[PDB]
Homo-oligomer: A and B are copies of this chain.
Amino acid sequence: SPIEEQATRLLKEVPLIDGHNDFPYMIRGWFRNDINGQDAHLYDMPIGQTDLQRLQKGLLGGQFWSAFVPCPKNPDKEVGSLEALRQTLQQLDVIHRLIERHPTILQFADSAASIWSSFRAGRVASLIGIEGLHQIADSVSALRMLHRLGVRYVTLTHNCHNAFADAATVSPELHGGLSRKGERLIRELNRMGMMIDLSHTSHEAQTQALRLSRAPVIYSHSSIYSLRAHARNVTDENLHLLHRNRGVVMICFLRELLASEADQATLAHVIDHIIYAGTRIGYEHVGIGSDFDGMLRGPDGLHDVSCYPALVAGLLERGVSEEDVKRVMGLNVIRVLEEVERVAAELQGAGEECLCDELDEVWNEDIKEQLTRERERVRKL
């Protein structure tokens, strides 16, 4: 069809960059992060919605691979929080090993330039994000090291309240949006060049983050509230504040977020959600945030990662212009990552102070007096 050829041409011209995929957690579930001699299975998986053959088939240009670990369930709160940090490094490790063992398909990217150079070579631009602040174990130092390991967005919560912000799906509220720590962390995230992700966060937490953030944010996988009322979806209030923020809402394929009955959800519903946001806040603030492998089953026509050409063709069929489809595919999320890095460079160039952790005193006054006495002895030599 001339529409199918058009969709294939667009997928070759610009990268379709998906906002969120939990394929790394499926590798932890199925293989337990042991991928040695598992290429046959990694190319043709016996479970899930993602594998390396189907990833090629769908012509996907880039991917933010999620490094999610569950919210801590342990009665010992210190152990659970610290356990999440160790599991985070295990998931970042298997993501890096997955990319490194398959260099013909996947290539690591952590910027707008690295996404393009990956797309020119014919690879899937492989970026990384974490699904929740619980993953850092209350350590802003750890968060900066996660940025150094290649993490380029941080979802503020998953399905649990943390010290920084409230989750959408948990009641009662803890902070009523962001905490004081949360407000201060927004400045640090803008300073370091970490992209803020407002998926899974409460409506009040979104409103406060959108007003405070000096850089554009994203919703890595969230849908529209007006079309389907759910705690996880974005309200018209927050859609307008996203426009002022210059952020992007990357539309989710979760069936619960598209229809009241999950079995009724379809590819057409995803297109309705993209067109709604594109009509009201412009097509330069809308994206694609599948959440593949964060669900058992997908919508009719969006069953797995091979179905992206159907989404591009469906948007063109509805009268969304080529230029606007290219924006929704990936140009918008590239711009936000580019603007996040530019803001960080401005703030780092200006010499803004970084947020430091609260640490225990290791030395008492006796030790500090010995050290000062010792220094003075060396001065008199």
A48 to chain B: which residues have CB within 8 Å? 371, 375
A370 to chain B: which residues have CB within 8 Å? 296
Contact with B along A28-67 (1 / 0, CB 8 A): 1110111011000000011111000000000000000000
Q: Is A334 an interface residue (CB 8 A)?
A: no
Choose the segment among A10-18, A220-228, A238-246, A354-362 that binds chain B (4+ C-beta atoms closer than 8 Å). A354-362
Q: Is A97 an interface residue (CB 8 A)?
A: yes
Residue of A45, A79, A149, A357 most packed against chain B (CB within 10 A): A357
Given contacts A45-B375, A296-B371, A303-B381, contact A359 B90 (CB under 8 A): yes
- The chain B residue with its CB closest to the CB of A303 is B378
Taking a contact as CB atoms under 8 Å apart, the answer to whether A141 and B94 are in contact is yes
Given contacts A34-B356, A89-B139, A149-B148, contact A29 B362 (CB under 8 A): yes
A47 to chain B: which residues have CB within 8 Å? 368, 371-372, 374-375
Choose the segment among A80-88, A250-258, A277-285, A315-323 that binds chain B (4+ C-beta atoms closer than 8 Å). A80-88
Taking a contact as CB atoms under 8 Å apart, the answer to whether B141 and A93 are in contact is yes
Residue among B82, B93, B367, B378 making CB contact with A145, cutoff 8 Å: B93
Q: How far is the CB of A326 from chain B (nearest CB, A)?
A: 28
Q: Is A92 an interface residue (CB 8 A)?
A: yes
CA distance A237 to B368 in the complex (A): 41
A90 to chain B: which residues have CB within 8 Å? 139, 141-142, 357, 359
Taking a contact as CB atoms under 8 Å apart, the answer to whether A359 and B85 are in contact is no
- The chain B residue with its CB closest to the CB of A362 is B29
CA distance A228 to B221 in the complex (A): 64
Q: Is A270 an interface residue (CB 8 A)?
A: no
CA distance A310 to B341 in the complex (A): 46
Q: How far is the CB of A356 from chain B (nearest CB, A)?
A: 4
A86 to chain B: which residues have CB within 8 Å? 82, 85, 137, 139, 142
Interface size on A, as a range, is 35 or more
Q: Is A304 an interface residue (CB 8 A)?
A: yes
Q: How far is the CB of A242 from chain B (nearest CB, A)?
A: 32
Given contacts A145-B92, A145-B93, A304-B378, contact A36 B139 (CB under 8 A): no
Residue among B82, B357, B363 making CB contact with A33, cutoff 8 Å: B357
Taking a contact as CB atoms under 8 Å apart, the answer to whether B82 and A359 are in contact is no
A32 to chain B: which residues have CB within 8 Å? 356, 359, 361
Taking a contact as CB atoms under 8 Å apart, the answer to whether B297 and A359 are in contact is no
Q: How far is the CB of A380 from chain B (nearest CB, A)?
A: 11
CA distance A347 to B85 in the complex (A): 30
- The chain B residue with its CB closest to the CB of A356 is B34
A137 to chain B: which residues have CB within 8 Å? 86
Q: Is A353 an interface residue (CB 8 A)?
A: yes
- The chain B residue with its CB closest to the CB of A100 is B348
Q: Is A342 an interface residue (CB 8 A)?
A: no
CA distance A375 to B142 in the complex (A): 37
**Interface residues of A, Cβ cutoff 8 Å to B:** 28-30, 32-34, 36-37, 45-49, 76, 78-79, 82-83, 85-86, 89-90, 92-94, 96-97, 137, 139, 141-142, 144-145, 148-149, 296-297, 303-304, 353-354, 356-357, 359, 361-363, 367-368, 370-372, 374-375, 378, 381
List 20 A-B residue pairs with CB atoms under 8 Å apart, sorted by A's residue number.
A28-B359, A29-B363, A32-B359, A33-B141, A33-B357, A33-B359, A46-B375, A47-B371, A47-B374, A86-B142, A89-B142, A90-B141, A90-B357, A94-B141, A96-B148, A148-B148, A148-B149, A296-B370, A296-B371, A303-B378
The 6 lowest CB-CB distance pairs between A and B, nearest first, are A82-B82, A93-B141, A47-B371, A32-B359, A36-B353, A90-B141
